[PDB]
Amino acid sequence: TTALVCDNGSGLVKAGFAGDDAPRAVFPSIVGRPRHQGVMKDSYVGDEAQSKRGILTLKYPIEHGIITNWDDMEKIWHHTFYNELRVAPEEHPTLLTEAPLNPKANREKMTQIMFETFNVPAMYVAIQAVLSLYASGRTTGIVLDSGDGVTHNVPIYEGYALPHAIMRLDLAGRDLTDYLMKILTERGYSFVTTAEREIVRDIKEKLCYVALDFENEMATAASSSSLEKSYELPDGQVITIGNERFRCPETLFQPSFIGMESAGIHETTYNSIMKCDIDIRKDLYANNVMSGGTTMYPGIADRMQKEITALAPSTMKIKIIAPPERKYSVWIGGSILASLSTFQQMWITKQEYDEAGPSIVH
Amino acid sequence: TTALVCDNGSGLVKAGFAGDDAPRAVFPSIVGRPRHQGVMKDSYVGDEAQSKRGILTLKYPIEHGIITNWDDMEKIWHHTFYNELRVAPEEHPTLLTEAPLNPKANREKMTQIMFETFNVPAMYVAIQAVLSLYASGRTTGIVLDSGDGVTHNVPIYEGYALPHAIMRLDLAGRDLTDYLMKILTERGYSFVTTAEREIVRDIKEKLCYVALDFENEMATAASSSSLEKSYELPDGQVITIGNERFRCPETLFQPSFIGMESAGIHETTYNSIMKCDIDIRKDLYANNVMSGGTTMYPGIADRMQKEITALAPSTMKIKIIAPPERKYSVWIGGSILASLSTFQQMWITKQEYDEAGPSIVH
Amino acid sequence: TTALVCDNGSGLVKAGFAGDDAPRAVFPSIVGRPRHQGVMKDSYVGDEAQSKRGILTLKYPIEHGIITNWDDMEKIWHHTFYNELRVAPEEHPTLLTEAPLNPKANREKMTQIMFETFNVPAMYVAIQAVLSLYASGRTTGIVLDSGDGVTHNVPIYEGYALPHAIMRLDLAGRDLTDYLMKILTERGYSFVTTAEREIVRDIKEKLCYVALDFENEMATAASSSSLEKSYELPDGQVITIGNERFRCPETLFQPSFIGMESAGIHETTYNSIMKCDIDIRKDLYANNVMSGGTTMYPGIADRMQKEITALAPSTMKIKIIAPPERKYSVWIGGSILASLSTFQQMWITKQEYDEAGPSIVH
Amino acid sequence: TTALVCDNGSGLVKAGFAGDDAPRAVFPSIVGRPRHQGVMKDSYVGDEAQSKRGILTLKYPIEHGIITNWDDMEKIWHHTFYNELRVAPEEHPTLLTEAPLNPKANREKMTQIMFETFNVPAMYVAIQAVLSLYASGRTTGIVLDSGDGVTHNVPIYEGYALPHAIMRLDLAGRDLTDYLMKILTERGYSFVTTAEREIVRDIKEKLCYVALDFENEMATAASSSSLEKSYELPDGQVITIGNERFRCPETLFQPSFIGMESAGIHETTYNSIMKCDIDIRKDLYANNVMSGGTTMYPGIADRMQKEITALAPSTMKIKIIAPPERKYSVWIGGSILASLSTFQQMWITKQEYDEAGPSIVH
Amino acid sequence: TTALVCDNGSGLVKAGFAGDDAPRAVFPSIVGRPRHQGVMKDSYVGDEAQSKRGILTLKYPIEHGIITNWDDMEKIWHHTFYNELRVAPEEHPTLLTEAPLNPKANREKMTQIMFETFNVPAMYVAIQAVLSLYASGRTTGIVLDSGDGVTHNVPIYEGYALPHAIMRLDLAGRDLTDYLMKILTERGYSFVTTAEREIVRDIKEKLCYVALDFENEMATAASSSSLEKSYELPDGQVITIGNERFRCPETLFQPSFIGMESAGIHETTYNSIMKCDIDIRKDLYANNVMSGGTTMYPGIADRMQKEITALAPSTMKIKIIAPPERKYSVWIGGSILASLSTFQQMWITKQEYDEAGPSIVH
Numbered sequence A, B, C, D, E: 001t002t003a004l005v006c007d008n009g010s011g012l013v014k015a016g017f018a019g020d021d022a023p024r025a026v027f028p029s030i031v032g033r034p035r036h037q038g039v040m041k042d043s044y045v046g047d048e049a050q051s052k053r054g055i056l057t058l059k060y061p062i063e064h065g066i067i068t069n070w071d072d073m074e075k076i077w078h079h080t081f082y083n084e085l086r087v088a089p090e091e092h093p094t095l096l097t098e099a100p101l102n103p104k105a106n107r108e109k110m111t112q113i114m115f116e117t118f119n120v121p122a123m124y125v126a127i128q129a130v131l132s133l134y135a136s137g138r139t140t141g142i143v144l145d146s147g148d149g150v151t152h153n154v155p156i157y158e159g160y161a162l163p164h165a166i167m168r169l170d171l172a173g174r175d176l177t178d179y180l181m182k183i184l185t186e187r188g189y190s191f192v193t194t195a196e197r198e199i200v201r202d203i204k205e206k207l208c209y210v211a212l213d214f215e216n217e218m219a220t221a222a223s224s225s226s227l228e229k230s231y232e233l234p235d236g237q238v239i240t241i242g243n244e245r246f247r248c249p250e251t252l253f254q255p256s257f258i259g260m261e262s263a264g265i266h267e268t269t270y271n272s273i274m275k276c277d278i279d280i281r282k283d284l285y286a287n288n289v290m291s292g293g294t295t296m297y298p299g300i301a302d303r304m305q306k307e308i309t310a311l312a313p314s315t316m317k318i319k320i321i322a323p324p325e326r327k328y329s330v331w332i333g334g335s336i337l338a339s340l341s342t343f344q345q346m347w348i349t350k351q352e353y354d355e356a357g358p359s360i361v362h
């Protein structure tokens, strides 16, 4: 029987069964609806929306970790269970995930629906970063979890999270996508459509990388070189991309490029550690775990180390952990946690919920 | 001596001397070449192309704010200086204008030519929207600059532009022209030629207006009424136009009519403001400046106010500024700026350019 | 001629002339610099930074009572004298204030600058809490002085301070501000910017209050009631705030909410008294003076009395003194002290300083 | 005019005018000086030192009947005349008192000061015990005079003192005070300060009593009973005292409790009588006069009788005289003596002194 | 079989088996409990609390030699026997230690628990100072025993303690720790946390020393010199400490620095000797034994000699004994005493106790 694990985040839905070592269904959190008049099914989800992307207007029900369009959200869950996993929801307890510091009501309504729409016998909502650490197999470390919608820092020491130093930025994969949509027009590549937004997403994933030394990377870039790469569009049009390959991901470190007043990840993580007790700090430095799909950028860990070692004390050893399959870290953690025998009492039982009411999930 | 100001945009070339309160030469950015065999001068520009429009194939060297046909572009500049303004280029520094977010290379090559072909001692390229604001005489406001080729929103606050919220659409005067060429065929008026495209341009300017309440405007239109207007073609053929008088300009607000997935101007401007800091927003709302010839449509400002006040907060005062001579706003701003004594150090000197190289203009 | 009194604290600069009953210049200790590229004056202070808050990055030169950014600090002093008070520094002796237990070097360098940059003929640095007591007009009492950067307890008996029982916490107005920036996101109000930090400051001052019975205040809060208040943002957006109105100021009493291991103010003050001689204690209890702008919270005095009477002996009369204009207490005291004829020998004369050297101020 | 009588002893200064039936000024022989840094008058005397006791370090210029700190001693005399009695010293002759067997130089210097500092026209120094007997109105009896600093036995028969049997112990009120400061820590009441020493003095005077049968008083004390008393400190702290109520005064009878090898008062007085002629003894037994403030303990006379009757012969009638106002006995005697017409030739005249020199007072 | 010796003092627990020449278990008397929410074992002792110090709130069950938190006290004893020594309590008689003049009830309850909780067949409580002398191997000397919680002087002559001259101060290692926590903020090192208190403890032990000539040590300190030392925090932050290295331990000699009215150790010890018989004094002077961990400060013995020789007579030889391993002196003495054959009758047998009752231990 076991249980279901559903990392219902922004961008991608990663779902499978608790106890498995990998998701069974990985697909976009996208709902598509016929842009053009048509009628010469007005509801496509995930891979459907992808395959018919050039007709549909693609929407993301979740933005910045927040479920905005609840109808579309429900729609996706429906597919997740009935069409993707092929499971009768009510036979399994469900583990959901959430980004720390989300609007309280987000979780409240989310779990409500699981109980009412899907008749899920029991459920639990876990903080994504916590699961990520748990996935790697550590009790101590600071988690830099950065995905499509949010970026956050959660410091955990020997099983104890330190809430007061949790950091959260809106810089994320989707912002990076849009930044390319902007700067590609410097060459003239008007990637202005939603379909093109998705194309650009593919461009990120294949061509972008993190500069180790941005200033000299730009100096290098000024000279014609290996930096220049070609890319094949769906219509056969070849795109030449150069500076943008690293100028885009650099915005994670220099947010002002996009327009954010906040500090870059380097300093954001640093500050999180600064807000923790001195006796803890050392261990956080030696256990800096990165996870989430934006950390899939080439050399992001190396650049991270470079700058955080500059920020920290010279006698402070810093180790960044880049556990491969970073992209699925949270889901993995969920699988583990749900299988854990000492986690069974953590399930909120429908009966219990019905008695207690919404508030119980917080 | 002073200087020259040249608003070399799409559709119209607006040129004159810095310090004047109006352009001296206003003519179409059109190059015409004998369509028919002929030979029973194969290069006509502006008013020439207009006067001989029924023979020539009329081309626009600039499209969507981008100089596409550089040979024809140069040709027009040649006439601008030598035949229109009657000026020996090299005696004056030249102010050029450009739509924000254009292909970097556009400006690069443009200025190259000014230095090499015309020996222009010095030059400067300014963003059109910026000049527009400057023309009205404000340091704060959001500029909705919409002309023949592009539509864009530039938010400026006390002299500081906010790049990250600049919006840009391809909806424009030329698109509107073509939309009429399409929908006039509903009655049967096959305006399919290039010559006819130009005729239709005239039709826009004289008969189109912006509906305040499109839905009831259509309901009104369903009944025979004052809406129906006659129009005289060059060959004496009378054209009857009704619904189209407002259905065409409505596409600026409902882009899907043409086929664009983007939001209408109402929401485009709104979103631009949303991306700006909350402390700024209020002033942007009370200083919404419209400029560019597409804003010459009757009641476009009133309709704009209607919808943006619907989008904004009920406690938010919104004022739309429609400074008459909107059509020449940018050029006016240029004249002012160039005359400004504290602008003289902004000129890029040929010597300086020759040393630095192309990149200096960015 | 008289003298100048300058309560150069964190958050607000309160300055005026000695002998006046109120400050002449009250403005924020803030330096603002253009966040965005700009240049489409890069130094704004106090009210300037406020008026242009949505462009500038606002920094506080002073943090936790410590002058961190000395260049910006000097900048503010410059404005204080030349633009705010309109006084030629060198014509007046200056009274400065300082929070007890500050880094020795803070005062050293501060006074150095007054002598060297501003040519101030003479000066004196007084402990803020001492002046506060002096302002109320008492020789005996314990001063709970709590402002933007620091909170401290100074026990004074018949003119004799008791150093060994001075308490000092980092809990302060600014921390409270940030706590709201955090907990408002429970509803979803992402007040994440610096501009928004300032907006939140305004929210504190208008909506926050101190719960008398926090536990039942929360129980009350659980039910929809009068607790819920609306707030108008600069962009017209209405914010609904409830629990947070008292959960924020409660952190002064339960520091762990923020993340501090220290005791709440109740016990902090109590402990200060415990460290004083038994023969003194009684009078300290009957003369508990509160001052500083954080004590402007509604009912903070009443709550204070409640808990301190619980902590103290049942036969011990406790009276909390909330002398209105608590917010300006220190400055007032300074005015009085400086006017005092028997205070004139306390001025450190530039000549004297030049001979003695820095150390003299301690 | 009359004269002044000044019982300048340890602990208390009892002064007034000769001829009065009571002292006009009764205050502590204490000089207080600001313990803490202060200066945020460094000389307080008597009631001043008491009122400001929690700041000042309280010192007793006199210890064990000996003037140790002469500067502080003079200080007190200054107040005695100028602030307390409001008398111009030089207008009156002064009667001083002294404990028998004091260091010769004590009297020498004391009287010197009266003549030189205060210009006292004439003076006389009387033995305290002698005056005490004189106060009661007897010519025969043995005087047990026991106060703050000394305890002594002076046997006088029909106006003739018997020097060779004068006894003197250092056991005294102050020692008893300190003994409580010690034994109260058995319960945990750390009365360790000087301020607390004074508090403990108050405790003595209100709660201590002399056990009649110490051994069974302890046996009684072992059972929870009426013995337990509460006491209110200046800070409202309630103190519970039991065994100590009589264990402290018992040390007068069992000096080893403190650490003295000498015999208790019972045997000390007994021995004094033993050293007197047999023909005298009987009358001494029937006239055992107790005086001095330590004899204010409840039941001390009764206990005294108990034990001295045990020590003496069974046929020997013993009567202990406890003339109420024992505490002021000496001063009273002084008043009487000074008013006595046949005492006027006993005054040492300044002229006489100036001729004779110091030695005259012995 | 032998016995167990447990020097259960404040700060450190020093335990081992009687007959051994050193403790087997030396660990902090600290109980730690998760400060932060946690649960993302709530009872850590000694080395556990140390290793997890940055999470836990560390408490000392014993303060000033008094067991305050009995539950935590018991907890530590539990670990002492079961986890540290690995001994089944009931198989051994236990020697406990206590600081002279402690609250009677402290010992009463302590021994109760040993009999009831741990079923200890027999026990004895010895005065710490006595054991210390015994450890050195002397019958005559004055013991200056100064540790984490208390400082006391016990004079013993040829096996006879002299109770009436036992001195006791609250000045101690912990007070010194806190004094650094205060004065380090003069440079700006806000060591305000409990974790930091412990860090500061380490700072004491490695950098503090006793000035021989404090006044000229300060004069020396005024000049930049070798006095300045660096220190490495757990987070790699380097701390520079100078004056504080000796200003902190100086408070043992000038208590007013902290805020105590009592005399410094120099005079405290001196006075103890003054209260002893003159025939004894000489031997006490030549046998001044120092013990307890606060006497581990560099040069404390030398400074002690300096000042006590100033206080004593010039013909009085003074020798201070600093028997290395001063820190474990008491425990050592206990081991010896317990092994002593003529000490076996001193054990209080559970049977005996059960008959007699609590009071027997006094």
Ligand SMILES: Nc1ncnc2c1ncn2[C@@H]1O[C@H](COP(=O)(O)OP(=O)(O)NP(=O)(O)O)[C@@H](O)[C@H]1O
Pocket (backbone or CB within 6 Å): A008, A009, A010, A011, A012, A013, A065, A099, A128, A146, A147, A148, A149, A150, A151, A172, A173, A174, A201, A204, A205, A206, A292, A293, A294, A295, A296, A297, A327
């Ligand atoms: N292979 C890749 N290389 C670079 N970037 C990637 C890669 N894969 C994903 N990312 C991008 O960054 C985001 C990664 O998605 P993902 O980590 O699953 O976020 P999420 O956990 O699902 N959403 P959330 O945690 O709610 O913000 C997407 O926008 C991807 O475009």
Ligand SMILES: Nc1ncnc2c1ncn2[C@@H]1O[C@H](COP(=O)(O)OP(=O)(O)NP(=O)(O)O)[C@@H](O)[C@H]1O
Pocket (backbone or CB within 6 Å): B008, B009, B010, B011, B012, B013, B065, B099, B128, B146, B147, B148, B149, B150, B151, B172, B173, B174, B201, B204, B205, B206, B292, B293, B294, B295, B296, B297, B327
């Ligand atoms: N009187 C008018 N009434 C309505 N529309 C007009 C009028 N005049 C111009 N427009 C139309 O809208 C466009 C206005 O031209 P114009 O503002 O000069 O654009 P531009 O600034 O020259 N080109 P650009 O800024 O590069 O997009 C032309 O297509 C005109 O047909």
Ligand SMILES: Nc1ncnc2c1ncn2[C@@H]1O[C@H](COP(=O)(O)OP(=O)(O)NP(=O)(O)O)[C@@H](O)[C@H]1O
Pocket (backbone or CB within 6 Å): C008, C009, C010, C011, C012, C013, C065, C099, C128, C146, C147, C148, C149, C150, C151, C172, C173, C174, C201, C204, C205, C206, C292, C293, C294, C295, C296, C297, C327
């Ligand atoms: N009217 C108010 N109501 C509630 N809180 C206030 C009010 N006014 C000020 N405070 C807040 O608490 C702080 C008060 O400022 P203030 O007492 O002047 O501190 P300060 O004396 O200038 N700084 P310092 O003494 O150096 O910590 C600011 O953060 C205010 O937001």
Ligand SMILES: Nc1ncnc2c1ncn2[C@@H]1O[C@H](COP(=O)(O)OP(=O)(O)NP(=O)(O)O)[C@@H](O)[C@H]1O
Pocket (backbone or CB within 6 Å): D008, D009, D010, D011, D012, D013, D065, D099, D128, D146, D147, D148, D149, D150, D151, D172, D173, D174, D201, D204, D205, D206, D292, D293, D294, D295, D296, D297, D327
């Ligand atoms: N009401 C009282 N009850 C018990 N003891 C008292 C009382 N009054 C005084 N004594 C105590 O015993 C001492 C009495 O003071 P007092 O008899 O005036 O001594 P003195 O004559 O002034 N000094 P001296 O004769 O020089 O030793 C003080 O220490 C008092 O605390």
Ligand SMILES: Nc1ncnc2c1ncn2[C@@H]1O[C@H](COP(=O)(O)OP(=O)(O)NP(=O)(O)O)[C@@H](O)[C@H]1O
Pocket (backbone or CB within 6 Å): E008, E009, E010, E011, E012, E013, E065, E099, E128, E146, E147, E148, E149, E150, E151, E172, E173, E174, E201, E204, E205, E206, E292, E293, E294, E295, E296, E297, E327
């Ligand atoms: N190596 C050292 N150098 C300087 N000081 C030390 C050193 N070791 C210990 N002390 C300090 O002084 C105290 C010594 O501990 P310790 O002598 O064991 O006291 P204790 O006997 O256990 N407690 P107590 O006798 O009940 O007051 C601790 O606070 C230490 O920080």
Ligand SMILES: [Mg+2]
Pocket (backbone or CB within 6 Å): A009, A128, A147, A292, A330
């Ligand atoms: Mg995620």
Ligand SMILES: [Mg+2]
Pocket (backbone or CB within 6 Å): B009, B128, B147, B292, B330
């Ligand atoms: Mg234009």
Ligand SMILES: [Mg+2]
Pocket (backbone or CB within 6 Å): C009, C128, C147, C292, C330
């Ligand atoms: Mg203040």
Ligand SMILES: [Mg+2]
Pocket (backbone or CB within 6 Å): D009, D128, D147, D292, D330
């Ligand atoms: Mg007397």
Ligand SMILES: [Mg+2]
Pocket (backbone or CB within 6 Å): E009, E128, E147, E292, E330
């Ligand atoms: Mg010890």
